[PDB]
Each structure stands twice: as structure tokens, then as C-alpha cells.
Design a protein around this ligand. Structure first.
Ligand SMILES: [Cl-]
Ligand SMILES: [Cl-]
Lengths: 295, 296, 294, 295
């Protein structure tokens, strides 16, 4: 057992977790075309809404279900793209994008299509401004799902610089903003780029730490890279990476304290950086428990 | 102020430290032309022999003074080289290599010359063969504190690899054997490859951690800066991560030592060698944290 | 000598180049106040519109001048920045952004301000949708001129990946679409990311090759390769040039594939060809511009 | 399909190749225990002596056969090591080192053992001091033939710095000196360090270029590294690496010119660096024709 090192952060779950969870889970079991009974209860066991509530514990009470719905359908779609070629998976997603914009009408006979359509319709109806702002982050993520990335020599610095721009973590930060009703200005966002990049690496590395065993069923992970650079075992590497993650949590506290001392911390940004902290503690807890990293 | 993480390595100090320290410091205070008392006291206060006894606590009682003398002159030289050009520097040293070999007699007018000559002649008297074995390592080390640094990009991986072969660490390990009267076969040292690389890396990084602030008086070329940049954190955060890495290399050392005895096996010689390296790693750490050589 | 190796890419030049040059040069010679009659004649000598016409040989006739003016001003601001702190520079640029948006009026007392204002007001007047689409790429680029590089080890592979995402090259390819009046949806844009990344690299490396010398006073493919291979800078440029010819062959292959997989469209076919012209034009320009102290 | 770019170097073979080949071949056919008449044909077919004469065309007439015998037995052992574990192979070679020094007698009933003993005994009988000088280079090479590589992310720069210190190339340069009777002082050798390093990369890269297809039969090669750092195909990388090799040929000539311009190029040094030039052109022709790189 790894034994995480001490941390000043702590996981927190959204207050309405049980309530939203049943609501959203019901919706999908009702509308989604699962293959069989095994898949049906594998889905309930996954508890995507509980995942979402762990990542956005501070979302507004009336918007958390939106987040759960979006993440649930993306998790479902993600798992589906596993069984299809590049050309089909890409074609699959590109078709849902115009529908997501509301520009194209569903084929009410195809679950994923009307689920996606209705979802975005309802989000815009609740807040068009913020709903439109999160469209691109989602599309970016959706396009990356069928992305064929190059295997190339990559040291620790290159790998981390690359994770700093991860679109998955970007989608999470934007979805968090929507869930919290935090309309951040262009200026405010620029002010927390370092904080975002720092957070993005944290989430990524913690995922790497707990997914390595499974990854070692194109292996691109910080555990292998550090193990090879330092000439130690994967486990020793996980230990070193975990301490690096704590260094990043301390960096987060410092970047935030600085922001405030310079008087650049607005109420919106305060909620935001705190939201990120819970995304980090949440992701860690999720990583330690998710069945997706089992084997 | 930087709390080193827990370690199973316990450093030792050679019993005769006070004895040799007096003998060897007395010699140099008598022959080396120290500019003044201020330099005399600093030299003593630096106690180069105490450093030697910390790195080689298992050295044989009658050889430890050799190591102290050798290292003391190399530290005194090393000190002078920073007041010269790479060309002067290389000239100053290259002139001392023939003298170390014995082929060229001292100009008893230049202390360093006859101190180098007399010491080497004395080492052969005791054990000619072994005193000959460390000649290369000694020159390789001198033919390096003058060589130019071939720029080129460098990540953590490449920097660590390059340190696994540090010629300073090799001289230390070679000086250790001569000091412990260890005589390993060409095959024996071949069996501890990974152990020597892992140790040289430990020693280098611990040095990096404690010499960073001073080095940052200027380019750098140190694991501290490299990790700080690659992970995007402060140098202090980097020192703490690198320290944890050092403990991993200590755990790796033990595992490599285990496999060595289990798998096939060691030798009385390799068992002594291998333990010796452990003492270097811990002695090096105590030294790095206390030496003024890293003081700003 | 530095003899460029053979290339199947033939640069093109916009036929209206002379017409637009005197048109645009004259414009700045009237409003842009240079230091002396020499800095002036030096300007007309650089001919930034010729550069534009090499890059966008197929820009629409009634739009090529927009491109010329935008680059002519980015190049002028460029040289201007080289003489002020990373504070004075970022301030300067940051006030040209809202004004570029039309949200803030140009203090008519400062030329660069109203030149920018009128240029953008003018582009929106011609095609408001496509004009707003380049604001971002232009801003990203202007912001980039004012920040100091990162601070981490970088080998050839990382430097080349870093260049596949060059701000300037993205600006050029967005200016090009505006110039050719090419309305490309983000979906079609997706299908050519490899081609764009490939092109971006070609442009940056050819630039590194000819600007190395001037940059004598760094972050460049020329120095990185010279250190990695342990050869002279001149030898590195020669190896880099052969690599560029490989990227040109790659472009051709990517283009054939895009066409083979039923993914090609008339607008993409045009965009893809346009990037080719940029590669060959940029090379011709790089070999002759005085900007690099030929 | 792969056309070498123009070069100012040219391959050359040793005048006595036909004579030495017959002799050295005959010796091994007589003493080496080839399994069956089949392996004997394959052996003569390999022409290890002919390869030696391609790398050492300036060898003295009375010493070229020493080089042929040494390389022949090394090529033979190299192949045998293929059917052993790293540990077994290591023990095998470690046995032959004390015999090479002449410190331990051969077991006259084990061919490799007495063939090794007799070769060195005869080399020391021809030129004692120089023969003893090549001992270390041969042992380094013999030991390197069996240790682990250790996979680690590596860019073009790190891979080339590695090849600069290749023990194989160090063996060829030392053996070339013994074959040409060039006694080089410790100072002369240091003046040629850059040149030696430059030459090493050339031989290795040229070997990489032609051995690549063979290596793809499932790793660590300049072809692989460059294709992915530049993001082009292996074939394109080969074309680019070949031009780089030519740049190293120019650099060799330039380094020699400077060495000469300054006052440090003795006659021994001059014959040495010319010797390296033919090793480079020879290795190229060999790389182009050897069956060791085929199917
Ligand atoms: Cl994941
Ligand atoms: Cl030191």
C-alpha cells in the first residue's frame, strides 16, 4: 500500500449527492440503451453522479444535476468509443456537436442524440451566457477522445508541460465554473493561469499514480518516466511523485496567498481557487477508489 | 530549515580522526605556504582530514593518513584553480602529474611539487601495487577540474545518468579501496556496476541539495535547478523532492546488496566494499549539511 | 554558401503587390511619424507588403490590403518594442487591444492608436464575421511579443513540438483565411491539425535558419541541433534545411491522405494549398529580407 | 531506394586481403568447433577477415592477420552469446580474460580457450608493449557484450553522446593503432578526443541507418529517435541522418585542419586520423552490404 503523504486538503462531497444521484441515474437507466442487465447495474455501481459531486462539492444546488448529466453522458460515450475505429468514433462525436449547439434537431429515436440535445437546451434555458461559454471546452474534449497522439521521447518536464494543457482538466475547470455560477472575466482568468496549470498537473499525476498497474495491463505516464529517469522501481516513483504532488498543493496555497496580497483576488476568484482545491482532493479520493483503475 | 527525511543509513567516523587530523594538518601548516594566520585557521577549521574520516570510517588505521593527505592536497589545489584560467589551471595540474608518477623530481622550492612527490613516493613504499591502481583515478580527476563543459541540453534523466559516472565519485571509491586494503578483481568491480552508479548519484544529488544556494552566486547545472524547472516549483521544494529520491536510492542500494549476496554472491571484499559505499553516502550527507565549503 | 536543397514547392506572388505596396507604404508614410528621412526610406525598403503578398498570394483582391496593413503595423510595433522594457511593451500592446475591438476610441494624438482603430473598423466594415474571428489570433500574438520565455531544458523534439503551436504561425493562417475569404468550420479545421502543425514547424525552422546570425546578440532550432549533434551552426542549418524538405514531403502526403479518406472539401483544398504558398513564400522571404542583415 | 549523399571519403581494402583471408579462415576451420559442414560454409561466407581489411586498409602487412584473428573470434563469440543469458554470457567471457592476459592456461580441449590464449601470446611475441595496450579496450568490449541496456527516454542529443563513448568504436580505433604500429603518447591521444568522438557517432549512425529494418523484428536507434522528434517516417529520418553524417565528415576534416594549423599534429597522429577516415567509409560499405543487417 502506497500510504499517501500528509496533505492540508481534504475531499468533500456535494450536500445533495444522494438526491441528484438517484435523479440522474434514473434518467439514464430510463433513456440510455444499455446492452444487458449486467451493464445496467455496472452503471449504478459506477455512480457517475457521486463522482461529479466529489469533484464539484461547492456547485450551486440547482446546477449540480447539469454537471452530473454532462459527465455521465461523456463517461458513457467515452466507454463506447472504446469499441469503435478512429473514423467511426470521430464521426460519432462530430455528429453530436451541432446537436449540442442546438443547431441541429435530434433524431428523437436515438437516445444519445436527444439526451445530448435536451441537456444543452435545458442548460441554456437555465443560463444561456454561461451555457454557451462551456460549449467549446466540451467540444475540445470530445474531439480529443478520438485523438491519435504520437509516441515520442519525453522527459518529466516535457510530460508535465503537456499535462498542463490537458483538455480533460480544462473541461473540468470550465464545468466547475458553470456549476458554481462563477462568471469570470477575461482578466480574472488570466490572473490564475499558473494556478490552473499547477492544478492540472496535480490531477494528472495522482491519476497516473493510481492507474499505473492497469496501464501496465502506448505507455505515457509520469510513473514510468520518473522511474526510468531516476532508475528506481515504479513503486518508488509513485512515492516520489506523491511528494511532488504535495509540493504542488503548497504551491497552490502560495499562488492564492500572492493573488490576494496583491489585491487581485475577487470574490469570484476566491470561490474558484477553493473549487480547484476540492477538485484536487476529490480526484485523489476518486483515484484511490474508482473501479476504472482496478484491472 | 529543510528537514531531511528518515534514513536507515547511519554515518560513522574513523576512530583515529583526532590522531590523523593533527598529523596531517601539522604537516601542511608546516609545508604549504599559507598566506597568513587567517588562512591558517580557516584551513584547520576546514579539517579536510575529518572529512576523509567521515567518508572512510572503515579505512585501515595505517592508511587513513594517506587518504587525508591525498584529499587535503586535492582540496587545496581545487581551491587555487578557481583563481586561474582553464589553461593556466590545466598547466598547473599537468605539471604535477609526472611528479605524482615519480618520473619527475620536486623543485623543493615549490611546496605543492614536493608535497605531491613525497606523498606518492610514500604510498608506494607501503603498497606499491595499490598505490599504482589509484593513479589513473587521481589523474582522471585532475584531468577534469580543468576540462571545458560541452554545453548541450540536459533533463533530469540525462543529468542523473551523467552523475552516475562522476569521476570525483570514482576517485572516492578507488581511494576507499586502497584505504581499506581492498583488492578486487576486474570481474569483482564489474559485479557491482549498478551499486556504484546508484551511489555516485546519491552522493552527487545530496551535494547539489546543500551547495545550491552557494552555486547560485553567479549556467548552474544541478539537479536542484533542473527539477525545479521541470516540475515548475521553487528550489526549496525541489530540494525536498530530491531528498526523498535519495532515500529511494538508499532503499535501492540495500536491494541491490541483497540480490548480490543472494544471486550467486559477493565476496568478503565486495561485502566490505558495498558497506563502505553506504558509509560514503551517509558521511557525505552529514558533511554536506555541515561544511562551510557550501556556506555563502 | 548555404545552398537550399531542391524543393517541389514553388512560391507565388500576389499580382497586385506593386499596387498595394505604394497604396499601403504611402499610407504609413503619411500617418506613421518616423524619426528621420532615413528611418523612412528604410521603411519603404523593407517593403512589408511584398512580404504579405508572398505569404498570401491568393488573398482576394479587395482584401489583400487589409493583410498588408495588419502585418506592416505588427512589424513596425515589433521593431518599436525591441527598445522598451517588458513592462513598457506589455502596457503599449495591452491598450491596443480594446481599441482593436472598437470598444475604446483612438486618442487621435497617437498614430499607432488610430491606425489600429481605423484598420479594424475597416475590416469589420468589409466582413464583420470573419474580422471578429481574427481578433483572438491577433491578441494571442501581441501578448506573446511581451512575455519572456519559460525556463526549462529543451531538446530538439520539445522545441519542435513547441513550434507546432507557434502563435505567429497561427496568426498567419488565420489572416490567410480572412484574406482568401475562406469560412472554415472548427470541424474542417480539425481534419488538418497535422498539416497545420507540420506547416507551423516548417515556417519556424526556415526562420531560425536565416535569422540565426543576426540573433548573434537563445531559443532556436539551429543552436539546439548544433549542440545535440556537436557541429557548427552552419552545418546545423544545412541539416535543418533537409528536414524542412521532409516536412514538405510530409505535407504532400498528409494532403493526399486527407483527399483519399473522403475528408477533403473545396475550402480545405484551398486552405491546404494556401499553407504551401506560405511555406515557400516564407523561405524566399527569409533568404532575401534585410531584416536578417543579409 | 536509399541513396547516399555525395561524400569526399571512399572505402579501401587492404592489399593482402585474399592472402590473410585464406590464412585466418583456414586457422578457424581447423580449430573452431563448427557444428556441421553447413556452418562452415556460412562462416567462410561471412568473410570476417575481409571485413577487417575494409576497416583497417592501412594495417601493416605483418600485423593485419592479428586484427583478422581477433575480430573473427570476437564475431564468433558474439554469435554464441546469443544463445546464453546475460549471466551465462558474462561468465563465459570473464573466463577468457585471464587467459587473454596470459595469466591462466587454456584448457587445450576447449577451442575458444586455447585459440584466445595462443592469439594473445603471439601478439605479445610480436609487439609486447602495444599488445598489452589493447588488452583493456578488448576487455571493455567483451564485458559490454553482456550487460543490460536500461530503457530511458532519450533525445537525439543524449543518444549521440552515448554513442560517442561506444566501447565497440573504442575497440576498433585501438586495434587500428596496433595494426598500424602507431604508438601514441597519452598527450597525442587527448588532442584527438573530439575527432574520436566525432568518428564514433558517424560509425554508429551509419550502422543505425542500415540496421533499422532488421531491428524492427519484435528500440534504441538514431533512426527511431529522430523520426519521432521531427515527426517524420523512419525513411525520412534516415535521409536526414545521412546528411548529418556527411556534416561529421566535414567536421573531421576541419578538426584535422585545425589540429594541423596549431602546432599539434605529429606523424603518428596524421596516420591515425587518416585511419579513422577509412574506418568511416569502410563501415559505410560494410553497413551497406553485410548480411548481418538483412531480412
Ligand atoms: Cl482517466
Ligand atoms: Cl563539491
Amino acid at each position: 500500500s502506497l500510504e499517501p503523504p500528509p496533505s492540508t486538503f481534504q475531499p468533500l462531497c456535494h450536500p445533495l449527492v444522494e438526491e441528484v444521484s438517484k435523479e440522474v441515474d434514473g434518467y439514464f437507466l430510463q433513456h440510455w440503451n444499455f446492452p444487458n442487465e449486467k451493464a445496467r447495474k455496472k452503471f449504478v455501481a459506477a455512480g457517475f453522479s457521486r463522482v461529479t459531486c466529489l469533484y464539484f462539492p461547492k456547485a450551486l444546488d440547482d446546477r449540480i444535476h447539469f454537471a452530473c448529466r454532462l459527465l455521465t453522458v461523456l463517461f458513457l460515450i467515452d466507454d463506447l468509443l472504446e469499441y469503435m475505429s478512429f473514423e467511426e468514433g470521430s464521426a460519432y462525436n462530430e455528429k453530436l456537436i451541432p446537436i449540442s449547439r442546438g443547431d441541429v434537431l435530434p433524431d428523437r429515436s436515438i437516445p444519445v442524440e436527444y439526451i445530448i440535445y435536451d441537456l444543452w437546451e435545458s442548460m441554456r434555458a437555465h443560463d444561456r451566457e454561461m451555457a454557451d461559454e462551456i460549449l467549446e471546452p466540451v467540444f475540445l474534449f470530445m474531439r480529443a477522445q478520438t485523438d491519435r497522439t504520437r509516441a515520442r521521447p519525453m522527459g518529466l518536464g516535457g510530460y508535465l508541460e503537456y499535462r498542463e494543457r490537458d483538455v480533460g482538466k480544462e473541461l473540468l475547470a470550465a464545468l466547475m465554473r458553470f456549476s458554481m455560477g462563477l462568471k469570470l472575466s477575461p482578466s480574472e482568468l488570466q490572473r490564475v493561469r499558473e494556478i490552473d496549470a499547477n492544478c492540472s498537473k496535480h490531477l494528472s499525476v495522482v491519476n497516473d499514480i493510481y492507474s499505473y498497474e492497469k496501464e501496465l495491463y502506448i505507455l505515457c505516464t509520469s510513473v514510468q518516466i520518473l522511474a526510468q529517469e531516476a532508475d528506481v522501481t515504479a513503486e518508488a516513483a509513485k512515492r516520489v511523485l506523491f511528494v511532488m504532488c504535495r509540493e504542488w498543493e503548497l504551491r497552490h496555497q502560495l499562488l492564492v496567498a500572492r493573488l490576494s496580497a496583491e489585491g487581485l483576488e475577487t470574490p469570484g476568484l476566491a470561490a474558484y481557487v477553493e473549487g480547484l482545491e476540492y477538485q484536487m482532493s476529490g480526484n485523489e479520493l476518486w483515484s484511490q477508489t474508482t473501479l476504472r483503475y482496478s484491472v
